[PDB]
Ligand binder design. Sequence first.
Ligand SMILES: *C(=O)/C=C/c1ccc(O)cc1
Length: 125
Amino acid sequence: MEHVAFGSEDIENTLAKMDDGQLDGLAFGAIQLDGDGNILQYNAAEGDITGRDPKQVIGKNFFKDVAPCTDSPEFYGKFKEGVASGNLNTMFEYTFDYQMTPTKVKVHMKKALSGDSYWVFVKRV
Ligand SMILES: *C(=O)/C=C/c1ccc(O)cc1
């Protein structure tokens, strides 16, 4: 395992050192998005939660293509305000229900330490 707790205050500094292989050792799902919502990184734990194959969703748009259930003011709306503002740090519960059994999760969205990238972290509840 990589030992990093979900919700940790300095998580963006810790994850700045990991490559795709290290990200697969986290105890929670991790997605890195660009400012348009395209998927740059997608770890093994996220694929275990949602059924998606990580290598197949990299490059797709999360809000348009992969996760239309998140295209709502409650999820995408928060993301886009964060990108526009250049700051984002929010945690909320959500249900993922597209082409899968409805699954309740906790989501943490946080701006990355690098400029135009954003993390989405997911764990079951
Ligand atoms: C709603 O459409 C949610 C879909 C979804 C969430 C998270 C993922 O990693 C993949 C699909």
